[PDB]
Short mmCIF file of C-alpha atoms in Angstrom, two decimals:
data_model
loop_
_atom_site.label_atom_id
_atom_site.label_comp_id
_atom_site.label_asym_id
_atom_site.label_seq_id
_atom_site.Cartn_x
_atom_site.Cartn_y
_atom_site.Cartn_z
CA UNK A 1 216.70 -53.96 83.24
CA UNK A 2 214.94 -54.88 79.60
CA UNK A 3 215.73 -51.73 78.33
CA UNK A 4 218.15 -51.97 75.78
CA UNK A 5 221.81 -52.19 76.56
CA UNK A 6 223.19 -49.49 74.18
CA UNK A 7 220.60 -47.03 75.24
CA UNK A 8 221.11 -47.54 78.70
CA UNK A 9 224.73 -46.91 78.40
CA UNK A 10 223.92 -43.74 76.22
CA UNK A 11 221.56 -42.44 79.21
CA UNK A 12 224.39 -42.95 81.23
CA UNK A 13 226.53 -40.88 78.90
CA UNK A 14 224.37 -38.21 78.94
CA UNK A 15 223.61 -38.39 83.04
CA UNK A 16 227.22 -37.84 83.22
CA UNK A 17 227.43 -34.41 81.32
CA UNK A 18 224.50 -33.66 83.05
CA UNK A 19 225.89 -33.96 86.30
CA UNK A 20 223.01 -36.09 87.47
CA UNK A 21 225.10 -39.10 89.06
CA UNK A 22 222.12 -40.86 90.45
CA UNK A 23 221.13 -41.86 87.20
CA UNK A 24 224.10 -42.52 85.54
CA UNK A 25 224.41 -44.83 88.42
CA UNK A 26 221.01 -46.29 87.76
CA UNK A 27 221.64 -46.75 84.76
CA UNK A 28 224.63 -48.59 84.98
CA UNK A 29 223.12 -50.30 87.59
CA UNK A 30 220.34 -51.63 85.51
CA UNK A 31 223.45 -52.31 82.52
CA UNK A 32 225.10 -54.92 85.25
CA UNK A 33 222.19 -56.43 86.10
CA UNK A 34 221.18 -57.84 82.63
CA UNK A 35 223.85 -60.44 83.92
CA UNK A 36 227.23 -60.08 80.92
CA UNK A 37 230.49 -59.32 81.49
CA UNK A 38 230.72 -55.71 81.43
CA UNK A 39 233.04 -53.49 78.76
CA UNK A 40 236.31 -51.75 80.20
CA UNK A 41 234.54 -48.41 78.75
CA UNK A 42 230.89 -49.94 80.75
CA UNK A 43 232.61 -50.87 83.94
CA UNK A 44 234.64 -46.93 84.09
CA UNK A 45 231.22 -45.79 83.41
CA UNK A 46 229.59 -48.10 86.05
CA UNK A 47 232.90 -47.16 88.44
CA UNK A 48 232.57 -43.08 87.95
CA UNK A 49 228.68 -43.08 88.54
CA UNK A 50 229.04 -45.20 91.68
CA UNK A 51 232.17 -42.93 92.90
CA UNK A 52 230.14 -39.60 92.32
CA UNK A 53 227.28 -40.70 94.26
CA UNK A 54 228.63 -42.12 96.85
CA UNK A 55 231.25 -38.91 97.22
CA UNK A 56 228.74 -36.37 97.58
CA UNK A 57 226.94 -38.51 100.47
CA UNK A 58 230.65 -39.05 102.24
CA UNK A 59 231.05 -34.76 102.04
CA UNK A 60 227.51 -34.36 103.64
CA UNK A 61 228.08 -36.27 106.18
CA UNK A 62 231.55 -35.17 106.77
CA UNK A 63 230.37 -31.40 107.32
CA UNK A 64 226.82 -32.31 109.03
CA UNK A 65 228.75 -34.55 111.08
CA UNK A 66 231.39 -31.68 112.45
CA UNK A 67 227.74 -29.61 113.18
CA UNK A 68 226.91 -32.77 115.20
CA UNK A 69 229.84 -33.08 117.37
CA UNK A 70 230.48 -28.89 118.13
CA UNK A 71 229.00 -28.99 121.84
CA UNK A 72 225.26 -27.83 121.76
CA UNK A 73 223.17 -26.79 124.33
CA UNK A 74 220.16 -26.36 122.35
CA UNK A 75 218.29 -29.45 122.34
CA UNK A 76 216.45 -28.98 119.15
CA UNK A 77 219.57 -27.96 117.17
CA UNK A 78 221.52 -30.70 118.61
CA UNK A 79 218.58 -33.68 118.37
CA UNK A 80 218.04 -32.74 114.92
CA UNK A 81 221.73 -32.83 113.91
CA UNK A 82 221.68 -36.24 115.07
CA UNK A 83 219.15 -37.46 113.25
CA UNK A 84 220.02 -35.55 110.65
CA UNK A 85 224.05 -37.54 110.38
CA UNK A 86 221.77 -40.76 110.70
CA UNK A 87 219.48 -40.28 107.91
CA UNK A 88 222.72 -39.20 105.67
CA UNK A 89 224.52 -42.24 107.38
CA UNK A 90 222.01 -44.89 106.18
CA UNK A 91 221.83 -43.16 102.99
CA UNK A 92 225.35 -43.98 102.59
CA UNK A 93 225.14 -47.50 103.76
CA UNK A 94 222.47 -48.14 101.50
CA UNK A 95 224.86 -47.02 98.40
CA UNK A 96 227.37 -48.88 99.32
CA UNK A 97 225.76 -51.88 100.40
CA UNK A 98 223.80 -51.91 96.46
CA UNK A 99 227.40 -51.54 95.23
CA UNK A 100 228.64 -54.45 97.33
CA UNK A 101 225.66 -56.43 96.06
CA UNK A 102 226.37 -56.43 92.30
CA UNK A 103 230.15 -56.91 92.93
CA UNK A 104 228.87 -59.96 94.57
CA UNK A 105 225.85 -61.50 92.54
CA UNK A 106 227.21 -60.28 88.92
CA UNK A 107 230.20 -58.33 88.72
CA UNK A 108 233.30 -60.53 90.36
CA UNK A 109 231.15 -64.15 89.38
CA UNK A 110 231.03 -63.14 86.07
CA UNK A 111 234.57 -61.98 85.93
CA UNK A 112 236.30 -63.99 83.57
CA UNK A 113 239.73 -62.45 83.12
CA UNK A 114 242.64 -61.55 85.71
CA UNK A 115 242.66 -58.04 84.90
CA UNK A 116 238.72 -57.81 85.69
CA UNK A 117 238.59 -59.89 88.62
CA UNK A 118 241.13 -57.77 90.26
CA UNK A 119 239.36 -53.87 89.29
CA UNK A 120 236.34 -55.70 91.02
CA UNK A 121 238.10 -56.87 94.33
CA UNK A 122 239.51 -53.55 94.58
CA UNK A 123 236.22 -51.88 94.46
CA UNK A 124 234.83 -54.52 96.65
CA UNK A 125 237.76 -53.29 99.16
CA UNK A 126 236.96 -49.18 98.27
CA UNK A 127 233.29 -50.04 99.26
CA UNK A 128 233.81 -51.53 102.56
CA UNK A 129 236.44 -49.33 103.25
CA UNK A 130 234.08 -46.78 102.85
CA UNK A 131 231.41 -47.78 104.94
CA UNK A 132 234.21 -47.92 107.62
CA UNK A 133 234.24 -44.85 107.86
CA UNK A 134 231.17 -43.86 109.07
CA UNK A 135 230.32 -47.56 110.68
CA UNK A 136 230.92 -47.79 114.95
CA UNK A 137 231.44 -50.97 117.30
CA UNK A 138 231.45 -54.42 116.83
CA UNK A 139 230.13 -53.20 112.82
CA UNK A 140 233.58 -51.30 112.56
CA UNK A 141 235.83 -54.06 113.01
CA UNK A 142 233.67 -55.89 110.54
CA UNK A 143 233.73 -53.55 107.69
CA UNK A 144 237.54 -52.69 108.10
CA UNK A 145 238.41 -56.32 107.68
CA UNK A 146 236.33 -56.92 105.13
CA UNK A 147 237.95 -54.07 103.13
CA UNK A 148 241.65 -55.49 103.52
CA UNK A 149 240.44 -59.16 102.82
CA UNK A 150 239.23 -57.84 99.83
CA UNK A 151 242.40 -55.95 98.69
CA UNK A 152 244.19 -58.43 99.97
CA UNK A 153 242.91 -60.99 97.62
CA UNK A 154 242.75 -58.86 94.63
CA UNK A 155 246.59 -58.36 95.00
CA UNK A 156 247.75 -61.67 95.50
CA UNK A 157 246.01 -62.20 92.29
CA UNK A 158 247.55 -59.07 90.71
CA UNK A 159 251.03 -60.34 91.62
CA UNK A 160 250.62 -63.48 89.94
CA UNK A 161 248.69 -62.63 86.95
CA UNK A 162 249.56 -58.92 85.93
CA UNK A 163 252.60 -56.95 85.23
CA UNK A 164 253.61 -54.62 87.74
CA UNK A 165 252.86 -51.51 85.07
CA UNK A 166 248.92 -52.88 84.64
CA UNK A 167 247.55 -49.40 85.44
CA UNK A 168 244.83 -51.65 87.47
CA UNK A 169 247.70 -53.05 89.70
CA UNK A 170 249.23 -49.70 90.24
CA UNK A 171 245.70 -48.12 91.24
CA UNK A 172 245.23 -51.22 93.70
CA UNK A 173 248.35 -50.88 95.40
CA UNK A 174 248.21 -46.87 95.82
CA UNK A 175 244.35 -47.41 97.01
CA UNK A 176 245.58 -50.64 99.28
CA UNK A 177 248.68 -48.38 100.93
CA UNK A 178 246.18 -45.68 101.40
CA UNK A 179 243.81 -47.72 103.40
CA UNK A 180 246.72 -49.06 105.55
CA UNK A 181 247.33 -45.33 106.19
CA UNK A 182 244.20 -43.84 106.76
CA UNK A 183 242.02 -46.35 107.70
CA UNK A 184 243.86 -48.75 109.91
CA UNK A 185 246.22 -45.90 110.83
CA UNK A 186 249.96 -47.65 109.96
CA UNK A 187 251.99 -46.08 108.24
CA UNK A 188 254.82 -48.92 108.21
CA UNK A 189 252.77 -51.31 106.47
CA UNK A 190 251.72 -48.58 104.23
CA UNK A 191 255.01 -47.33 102.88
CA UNK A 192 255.84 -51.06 103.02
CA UNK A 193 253.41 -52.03 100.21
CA UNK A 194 253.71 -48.47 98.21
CA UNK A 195 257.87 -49.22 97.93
CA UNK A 196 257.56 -52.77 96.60
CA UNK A 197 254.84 -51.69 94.11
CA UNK A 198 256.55 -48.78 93.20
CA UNK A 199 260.03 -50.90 93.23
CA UNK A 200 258.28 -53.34 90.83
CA UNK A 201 256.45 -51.46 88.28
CA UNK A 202 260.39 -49.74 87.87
CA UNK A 203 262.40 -52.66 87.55
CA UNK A 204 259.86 -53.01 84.24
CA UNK A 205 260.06 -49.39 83.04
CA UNK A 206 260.37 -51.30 79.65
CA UNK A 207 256.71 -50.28 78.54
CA UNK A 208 256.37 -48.56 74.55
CA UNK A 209 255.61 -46.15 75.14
CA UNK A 210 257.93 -44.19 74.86
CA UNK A 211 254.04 -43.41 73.24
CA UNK A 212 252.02 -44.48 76.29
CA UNK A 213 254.74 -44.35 79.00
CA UNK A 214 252.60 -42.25 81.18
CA UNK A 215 249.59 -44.60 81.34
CA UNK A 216 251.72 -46.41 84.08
CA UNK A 217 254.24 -43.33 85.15
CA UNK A 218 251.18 -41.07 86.79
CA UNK A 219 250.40 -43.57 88.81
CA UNK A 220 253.78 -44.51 89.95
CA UNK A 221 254.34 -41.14 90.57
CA UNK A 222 251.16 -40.68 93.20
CA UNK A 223 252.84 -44.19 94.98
CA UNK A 224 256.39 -42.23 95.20
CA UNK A 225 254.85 -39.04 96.47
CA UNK A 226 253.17 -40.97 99.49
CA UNK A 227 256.10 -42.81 100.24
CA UNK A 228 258.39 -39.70 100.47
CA UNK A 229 255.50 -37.52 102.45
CA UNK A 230 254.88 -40.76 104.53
CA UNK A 231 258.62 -41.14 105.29
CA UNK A 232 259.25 -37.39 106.02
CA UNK A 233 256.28 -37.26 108.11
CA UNK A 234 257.66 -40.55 110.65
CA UNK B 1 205.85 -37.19 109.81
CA UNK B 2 206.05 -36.29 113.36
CA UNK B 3 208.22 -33.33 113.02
CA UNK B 4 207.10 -29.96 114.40
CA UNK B 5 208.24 -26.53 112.65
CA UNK B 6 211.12 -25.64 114.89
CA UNK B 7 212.55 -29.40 113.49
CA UNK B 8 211.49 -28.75 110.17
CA UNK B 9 213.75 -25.56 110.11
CA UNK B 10 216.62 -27.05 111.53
CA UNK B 11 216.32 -29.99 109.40
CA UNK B 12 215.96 -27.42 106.36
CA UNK B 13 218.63 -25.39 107.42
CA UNK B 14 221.10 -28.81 108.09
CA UNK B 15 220.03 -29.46 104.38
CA UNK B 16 220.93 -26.32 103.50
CA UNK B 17 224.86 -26.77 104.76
CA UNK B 18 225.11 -29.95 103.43
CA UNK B 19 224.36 -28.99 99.90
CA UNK B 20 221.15 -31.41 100.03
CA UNK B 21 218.77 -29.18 98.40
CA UNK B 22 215.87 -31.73 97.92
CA UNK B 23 216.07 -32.27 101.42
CA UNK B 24 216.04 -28.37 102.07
CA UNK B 25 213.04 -27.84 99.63
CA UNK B 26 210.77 -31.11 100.93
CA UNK B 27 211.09 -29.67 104.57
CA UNK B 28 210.02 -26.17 103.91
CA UNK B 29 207.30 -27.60 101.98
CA UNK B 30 206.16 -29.13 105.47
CA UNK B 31 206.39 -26.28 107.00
CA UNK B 32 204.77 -24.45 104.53
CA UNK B 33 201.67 -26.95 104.43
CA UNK B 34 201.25 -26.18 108.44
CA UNK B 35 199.15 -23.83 107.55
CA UNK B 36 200.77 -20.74 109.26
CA UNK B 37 201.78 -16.90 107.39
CA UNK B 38 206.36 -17.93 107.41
CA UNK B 39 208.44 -15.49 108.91
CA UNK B 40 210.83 -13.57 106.72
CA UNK B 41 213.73 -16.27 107.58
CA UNK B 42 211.23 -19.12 106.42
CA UNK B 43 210.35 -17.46 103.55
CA UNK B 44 213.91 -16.88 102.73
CA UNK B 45 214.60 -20.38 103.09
CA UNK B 46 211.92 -21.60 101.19
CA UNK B 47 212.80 -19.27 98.40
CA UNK B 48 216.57 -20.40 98.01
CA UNK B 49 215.81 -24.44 98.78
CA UNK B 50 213.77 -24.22 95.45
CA UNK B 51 215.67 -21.97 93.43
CA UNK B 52 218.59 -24.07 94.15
CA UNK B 53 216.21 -27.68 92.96
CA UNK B 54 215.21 -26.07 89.99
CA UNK B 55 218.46 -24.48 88.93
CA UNK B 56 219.65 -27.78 88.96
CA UNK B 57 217.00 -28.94 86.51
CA UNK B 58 217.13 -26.34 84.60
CA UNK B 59 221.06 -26.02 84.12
CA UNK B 60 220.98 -30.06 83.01
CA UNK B 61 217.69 -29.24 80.84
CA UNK B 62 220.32 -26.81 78.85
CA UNK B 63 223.08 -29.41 78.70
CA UNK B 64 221.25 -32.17 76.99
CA UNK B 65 219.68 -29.47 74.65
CA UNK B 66 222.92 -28.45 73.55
CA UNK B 67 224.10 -32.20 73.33
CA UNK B 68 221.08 -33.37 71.30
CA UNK B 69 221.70 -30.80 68.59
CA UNK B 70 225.48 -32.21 68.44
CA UNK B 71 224.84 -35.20 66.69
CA UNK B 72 224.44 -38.17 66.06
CA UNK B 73 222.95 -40.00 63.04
CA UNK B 74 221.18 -42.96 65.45
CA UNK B 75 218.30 -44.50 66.08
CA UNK B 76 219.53 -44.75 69.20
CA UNK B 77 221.52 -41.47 69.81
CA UNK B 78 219.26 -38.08 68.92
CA UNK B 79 216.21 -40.42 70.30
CA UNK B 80 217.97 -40.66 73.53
CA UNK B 81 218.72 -37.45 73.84
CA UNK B 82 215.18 -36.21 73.35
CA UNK B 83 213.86 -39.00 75.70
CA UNK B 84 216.71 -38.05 78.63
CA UNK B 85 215.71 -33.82 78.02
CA UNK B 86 212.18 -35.28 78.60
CA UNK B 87 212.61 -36.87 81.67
CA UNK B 88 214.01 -33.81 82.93
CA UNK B 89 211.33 -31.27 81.80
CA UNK B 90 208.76 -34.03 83.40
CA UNK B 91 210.97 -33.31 86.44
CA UNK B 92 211.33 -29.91 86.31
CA UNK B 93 206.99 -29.86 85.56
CA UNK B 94 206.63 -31.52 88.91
CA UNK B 95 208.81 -28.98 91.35
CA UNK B 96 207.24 -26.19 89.54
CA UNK B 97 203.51 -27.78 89.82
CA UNK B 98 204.67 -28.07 93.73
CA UNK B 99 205.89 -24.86 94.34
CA UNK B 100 202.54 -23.35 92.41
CA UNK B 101 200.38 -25.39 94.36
CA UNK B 102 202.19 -24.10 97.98
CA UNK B 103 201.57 -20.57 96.41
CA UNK B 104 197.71 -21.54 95.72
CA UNK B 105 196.84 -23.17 98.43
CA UNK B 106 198.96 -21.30 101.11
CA UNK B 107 201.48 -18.64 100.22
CA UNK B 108 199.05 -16.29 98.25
CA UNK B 109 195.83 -16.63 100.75
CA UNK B 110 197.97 -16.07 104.12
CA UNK B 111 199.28 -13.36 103.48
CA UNK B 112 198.07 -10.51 105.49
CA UNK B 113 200.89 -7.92 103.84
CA UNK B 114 201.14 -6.82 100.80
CA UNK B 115 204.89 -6.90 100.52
CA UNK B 116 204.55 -10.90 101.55
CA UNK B 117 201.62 -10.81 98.83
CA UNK B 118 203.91 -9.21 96.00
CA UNK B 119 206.76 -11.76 96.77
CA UNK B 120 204.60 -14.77 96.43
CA UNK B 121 202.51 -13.61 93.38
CA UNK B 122 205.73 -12.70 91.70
CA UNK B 123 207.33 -15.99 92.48
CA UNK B 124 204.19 -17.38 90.86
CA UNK B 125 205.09 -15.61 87.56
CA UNK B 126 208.78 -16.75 88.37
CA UNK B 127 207.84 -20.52 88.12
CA UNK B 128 205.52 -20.31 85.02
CA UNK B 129 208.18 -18.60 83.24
CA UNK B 130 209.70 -21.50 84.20
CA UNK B 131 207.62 -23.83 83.14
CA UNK B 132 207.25 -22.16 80.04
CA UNK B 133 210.98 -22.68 78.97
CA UNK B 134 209.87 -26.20 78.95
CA UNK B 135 206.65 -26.51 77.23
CA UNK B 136 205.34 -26.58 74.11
CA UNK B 137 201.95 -26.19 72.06
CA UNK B 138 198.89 -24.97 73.39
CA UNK B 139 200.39 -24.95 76.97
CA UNK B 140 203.11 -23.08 76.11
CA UNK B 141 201.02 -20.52 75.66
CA UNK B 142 198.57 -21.19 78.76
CA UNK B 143 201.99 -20.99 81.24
CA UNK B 144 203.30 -17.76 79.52
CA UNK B 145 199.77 -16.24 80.35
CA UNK B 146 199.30 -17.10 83.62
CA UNK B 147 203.44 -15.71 84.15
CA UNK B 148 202.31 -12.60 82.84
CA UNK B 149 198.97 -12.48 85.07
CA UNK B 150 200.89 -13.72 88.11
CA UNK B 151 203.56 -10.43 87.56
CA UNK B 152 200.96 -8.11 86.81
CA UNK B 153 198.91 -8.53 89.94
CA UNK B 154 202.09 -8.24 92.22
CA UNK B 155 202.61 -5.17 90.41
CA UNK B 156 199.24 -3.63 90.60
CA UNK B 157 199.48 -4.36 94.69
CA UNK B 158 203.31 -2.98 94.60
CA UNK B 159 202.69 -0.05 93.14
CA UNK B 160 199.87 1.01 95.57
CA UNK B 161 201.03 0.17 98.75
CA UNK B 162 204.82 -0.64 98.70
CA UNK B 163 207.90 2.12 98.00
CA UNK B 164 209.30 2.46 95.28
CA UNK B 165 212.91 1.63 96.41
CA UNK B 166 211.46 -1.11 98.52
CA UNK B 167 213.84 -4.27 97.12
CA UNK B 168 210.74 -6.63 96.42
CA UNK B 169 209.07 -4.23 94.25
CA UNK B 170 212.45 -3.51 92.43
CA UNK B 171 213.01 -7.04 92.24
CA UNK B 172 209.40 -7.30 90.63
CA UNK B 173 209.98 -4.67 88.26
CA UNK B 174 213.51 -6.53 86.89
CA UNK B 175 212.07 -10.21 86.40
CA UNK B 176 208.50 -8.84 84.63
CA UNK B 177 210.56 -6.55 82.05
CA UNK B 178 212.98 -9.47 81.48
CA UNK B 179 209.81 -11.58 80.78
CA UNK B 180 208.72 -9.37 78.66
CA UNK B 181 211.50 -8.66 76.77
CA UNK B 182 213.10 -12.65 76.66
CA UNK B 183 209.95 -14.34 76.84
CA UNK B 184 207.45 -12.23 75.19
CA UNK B 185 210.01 -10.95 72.93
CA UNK B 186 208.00 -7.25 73.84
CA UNK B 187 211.13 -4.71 74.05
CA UNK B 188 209.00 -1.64 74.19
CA UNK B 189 207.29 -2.60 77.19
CA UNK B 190 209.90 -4.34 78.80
CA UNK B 191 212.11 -0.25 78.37
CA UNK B 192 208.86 1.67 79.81
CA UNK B 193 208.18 -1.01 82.80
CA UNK B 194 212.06 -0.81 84.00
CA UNK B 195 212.27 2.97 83.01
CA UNK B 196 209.52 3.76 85.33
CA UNK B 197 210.18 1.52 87.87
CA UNK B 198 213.82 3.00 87.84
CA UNK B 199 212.69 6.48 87.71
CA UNK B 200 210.19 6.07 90.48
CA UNK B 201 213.27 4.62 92.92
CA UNK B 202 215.61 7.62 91.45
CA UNK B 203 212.58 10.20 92.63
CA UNK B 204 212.68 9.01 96.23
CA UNK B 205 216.22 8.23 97.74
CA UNK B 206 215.59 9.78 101.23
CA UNK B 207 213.18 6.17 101.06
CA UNK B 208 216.15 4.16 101.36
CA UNK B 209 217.61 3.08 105.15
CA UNK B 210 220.19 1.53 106.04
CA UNK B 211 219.24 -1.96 106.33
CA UNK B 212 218.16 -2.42 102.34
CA UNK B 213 220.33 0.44 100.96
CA UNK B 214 222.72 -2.25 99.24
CA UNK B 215 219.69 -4.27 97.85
CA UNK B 216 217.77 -1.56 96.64
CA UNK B 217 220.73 0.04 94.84
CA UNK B 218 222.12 -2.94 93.22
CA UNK B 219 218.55 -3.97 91.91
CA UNK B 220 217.91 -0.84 90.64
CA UNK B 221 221.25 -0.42 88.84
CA UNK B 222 220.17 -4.04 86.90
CA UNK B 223 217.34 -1.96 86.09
CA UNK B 224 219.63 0.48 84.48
CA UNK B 225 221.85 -1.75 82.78
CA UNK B 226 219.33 -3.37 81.32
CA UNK B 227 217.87 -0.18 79.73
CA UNK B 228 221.03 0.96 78.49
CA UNK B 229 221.34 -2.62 76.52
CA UNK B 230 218.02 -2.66 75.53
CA UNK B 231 217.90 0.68 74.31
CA UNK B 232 221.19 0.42 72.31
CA UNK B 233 219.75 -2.07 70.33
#
């Protein structure tokens, strides 16, 4: 937008405490398109507004779809139910698909920093691997690989460019073993990637903190909690 | 849209589960504009879809107040403030100038009741109180009179042809003394309308039935707690 960049990040701001997430997101929306690298405090706001959005569209259509499937005899409840999923559905793709789009025409292109290009590939792999969930067929298969290519390539990156404590690296690998969990269903390759991360970001526990320590501990702690519920669960 | 009202209901009452209020509110609107007197569920469904919209409005409306006078020494920051709030009253102006019109144009002339008449003329006063929390100047004024008219014809209809314990005319009675006593800052007749209303119920319990019991009671002990405040002070 030609709006000012200050006051459409103070909009944001206040779209936030107001709990009206569609605008925040517009507004950051509009914030990414004037075409400059974004803040770290910009892209968290761009990154929470997108988040927020997108979750309340994922919990419709979680409990409208259990309605849908629920046998039903009554062809008006049932037909409209349907349509119903759909419309939330689309809404969802739609979302995801305008988040996809600025990761792709301003946000990762513009990227000129390690740490940045990697939050961005990450997201690009959240996005997709959200519209996995509710995508079917040929679409599915599509969407799923997408995601991973995209986490795929932000962690290569990560690996050679960040330390294994970079809060952004941890957050990748604990979203990347999730994915391998939930959405491709493999729990091996999961725990696989959790333990080396986890395994790294120790061997470095030399962080100073002992003032910030838990910047990078919180997050280790969420990959170590999979990993034992993971291996006590195979 | 090619929808007929048995879809429109589903699709409002979908809405409804899925927290998609908007959604809920748009397709009782539909429904509404048919042209047909709604049942008691419709009504009831009508009722919460846009209660829930324009709680929504209203409860941000009260966060960016309370922001905006936090502060803030910007050209930017108190002007943003105000110009966010504004978007939000404009918002909050257009459900309640769509909900009025439904009442003008359908609600209010339908009816064939008067205790479907009474709820629709006092959700009329509800949503120009509302619209008066918003406004300023000369139509500030203009939208606390026509709450006021709106309440006092329900209440003139109530009163002759509906119970006293009946919940609707209870429910009446509460929001018209709590406009008089928050909005028109009148305590003396906001005390006599809920002392009468309360003393009328209190005269006729054998009234009550099984069905409403819970509703009538609980309305009418607001009734009473409010008079005990208002009284005490």
């Amino acid at each position: 937008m030609t709006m000012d960049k200050s006051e459409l990040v103070q909009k944001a701001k206040l779209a936030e405490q107001a709990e009206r997430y569609d605008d925040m997101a517009a507004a950051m929306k509009a914030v990414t398109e004037q075409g400059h690298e974004l803040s770290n405090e910009e892209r968290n706001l761009l990154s929470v507004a997108y988040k927020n959005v997108v979750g309340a569209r994922r919990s419709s259509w979680r409990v409208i779809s259990s309605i849908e499937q629920k046998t039903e005899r009554n062809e008006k409840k049932q037909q409209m139910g349907k349509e119903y999923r759909e419309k939330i559905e689309a809404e969802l793709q739609d979302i995801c698909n305008d988040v996809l789009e600025l990761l792709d025409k301003y946000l990762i292109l513009n990227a000129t920093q390690a740490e940045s290009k990697v939050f961005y590939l990450k997201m690009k792999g959240d996005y997709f691997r959200y519209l996995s969930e509710v995508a079917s067929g040929e679409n599915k298969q599509t969407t799923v690989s997408n995601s991973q290519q995209a986490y795929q390539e932000a962690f290569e990156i990560s690996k050679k460019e960040m330390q294994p404590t970079h809060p952004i690296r941890l957050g990748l690998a604990l979203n990347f073993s999730v994915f391998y969990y939930e959405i491709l269903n493999s729990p091996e390759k999961a725990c696989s990637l959790a333990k080396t991360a986890f395994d790294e970001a120790i061997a470095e526990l030399d962080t100073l903190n002992e003032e910030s320590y838990k910047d990078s501990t919180l997050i280790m702690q969420l990959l170590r909690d999979n990993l034992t519920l993971w291996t006590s669960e195979n």
